[PDB]
Amino acid sequence: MRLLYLHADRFEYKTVKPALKNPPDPPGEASFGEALVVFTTVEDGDGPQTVMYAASDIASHSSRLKVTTVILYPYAHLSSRLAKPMAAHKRLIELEGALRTKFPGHVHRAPFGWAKSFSIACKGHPLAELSRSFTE
């Protein structure tokens, strides 16, 4: 699993056209104030252990940043060892579930399988943009 942690002043997205033949989530849009936006690329061989490490780290980082909102944003582009779409969707659902057991704020998982437009205003402090790798 490869993640990018963007500490944002604001974030929004809208699904546009499907990017998979049959997207497993309905279309949607959402907008947020201050949030940790987590661009999430699920990799081949990510299992439940990987999900658990990611969730713990996101919760830990969120606490450090004093953010009360995390956006789990599926992203195909952080890796060249992607898990297949249905495995990826499952791992992202697990990640959302795991994060809720560790982090007490708003957890929003953006829909999987869509092309999206988005806007972000990313903060400029030294911890505002970090990357993470998890595996098992």
Place this chain on the structure above:
Amino acid sequence: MRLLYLHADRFEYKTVKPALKNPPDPPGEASFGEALVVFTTVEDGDGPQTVMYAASDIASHSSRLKVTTVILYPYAHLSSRLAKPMAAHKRLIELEGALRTKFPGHVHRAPFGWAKSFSIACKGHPLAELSRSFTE
């Protein structure tokens, strides 16, 4: 070299604190309309050939998208095999130079070695977010 191609409606950045002991570029800020924003991570063993392939591909993609502005945005976070900072800065300068021989529009290379704030509004079409790897 690992790149992320974001086709933006708008983009802006401001340097905040230095992220290297001695940043090789002066601080600054800039804002843009429609642009191809190229998040650029220089990797160990990127040489002139790698730069040349990247430049050709950026020019090719830009032409396809009909964009007339490219932002070369140094980014430490797309890879876990980074080139050292001074090699990275040199390769980014070369990339800017090479792109100008292949692409006729505005080429802006953002300063290297700074923490930055930024905002982007990214388009939602199927070619609006792509990743690329180049090597030699």
